[PDB]
Design a binder for this molecule. Structure first.
Ligand SMILES: CC(C)C[C@@H](NS(=O)(=O)Cc1ccccc1)C(=O)N1CCC[C@H]1C(=O)NCc1ccc(C(=N)N)cc1
Ligand SMILES: *[C@@H]1O[C@H](CO)[C@@H](O)[C@H](O)[C@H]1NC(C)=O
Ligand code: NA
Ligand code: NA
Lengths: 28, 11, 251
């Protein structure tokens, strides 16, 4: 649980997926 | 349509 | 998922497939919330109007998957169910209110690059992110259109919709234990969950701590991707006290 929501192939290696920025941009 | 899974999981 | 795209490898490592043993077929989506607990929709397991009443031995959970139909040797892990817990006030008679269920695995699953749990929201993260216009992400192996089936896991990002618009889109009684999401007719973009995506996660990435949170569970909709209709999702935070109660006493 301490490590929940952090993806090994993305957050854990500081790589972004192709559309997560679409989500961030909507969080105004 | 689905590929068969190892029998160990259906035992 | 209608009008989505192929998921990237490891994009949704909490995604779970609920798989029927006989005949071997996709039953639903679900999500991994710890090494031994899986979250899904109650209607994936219990829906008397369609003569659906699955027991533990009827099902398998497949974790770490990408391909819908392939057996993904050395990547996916297949788990048996110890026990199913359906919300005691799940309303299958009327409007699928409290459409939530937990499944405890017989053995803990090993985490990997492809298998990793999603967070459940706290009150604060829920309050911050569950706002009209804010987008979440839905994933699944369900139908590509209302009336075919994808080769690999599909993904779509969709905006949360204002409660009155949700209510005014349908004759079904909406409750506080549901929210709806999707584009409006005027907005041009489209996309929706569909049959087979049931039980899968609606997630949001917190901009405060960069973690993914499961805000919703794919619950119901009238058709798929219809103009003026929206997808409805179980409000995970509203039912979190039940979730914790189940895990606390049985886990
Ligand atoms: C409140 C309920 C009675 C409405 C019902 N609508 S429905 O049109 O039959 C759902 C459907 C079934 C098959 C193919 C397409 C769509 C429905 O969604 N049901 C009835 C019982 C279970 C649930 C369901 O099928 N859920 C799967 C689902 C389908 C569509 C969507 C969506 N976002 N469009 C979400 C979940
Ligand atoms: C569904 O199946 C269980 C077990 O066989 C049964 O006891 C129950 O009455 C059935 N209906 C439910 C849970 O609504
Ligand atoms: Na209405
Ligand atoms: Na729509």
């Amino acid at each position: 649980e301490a490590d929940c929501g952090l993806r090994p192939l993305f957050e854990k290696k500081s790589l972004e997926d192709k559309t997560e920025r679409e989500l961030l941009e909507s969080y105004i | 349509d689905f590929e068969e899974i190892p029998e160990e999981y259906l035992q | 998922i209608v009008e989505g795209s192929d998921a990237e490898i490891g994009m949704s490592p909490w995604q779970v497939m609920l798989f029927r043993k006989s005949p071997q077929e996709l039953l639903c989506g679900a999500s991994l919330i710890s090494d031994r607990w899986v979250l899904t929709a109650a209607h994936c397991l219990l829906y008397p109007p369609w003569d659906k009443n699955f027991t533990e031995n009827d099902l398998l959970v497949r974790i770490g998957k990408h391909s819908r139909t392939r057996y993904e040797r050395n990547i996916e892990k297949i788990s048996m169910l110890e026990k199913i817990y359906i919300h005691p006030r799940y309303n299958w008679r009327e409007n699928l209110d409290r459409d939530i269920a937990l499944m405890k695995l017989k053995k803990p699953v090993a985490f990997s690059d492809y298998i990793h749990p999603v967070c459940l929201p706290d009150r604060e993260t829920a309050a911050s992110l569950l706002q009209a216009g804010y987008k979440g992400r839905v994933t699944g192996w369900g139908n590509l259109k209302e009336t075919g089936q994808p080769s690999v896991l599909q993904v779509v990002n969709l905006p949360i919709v204002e409660r009155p618009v949700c209510k005014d889109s349908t004759r079904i009684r909406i409750t506080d234990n549901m929210f709806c999401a999707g584009y409006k007719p005027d907005e041009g973009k489209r996309g929706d969950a569909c049959e087979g995506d049931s039980g899968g996660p609606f997630v949001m990435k917190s901009p405060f701590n960069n973690r993914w949170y499961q805000m919703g569970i794919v619950s119901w909709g009238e058709g798929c991707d219809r103009d003026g209709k929206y997808g409805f999702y179980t409000h995970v935070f509203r039912l979190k006290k039940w979730i914790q109660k189940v895990i606390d006493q049985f886990g």
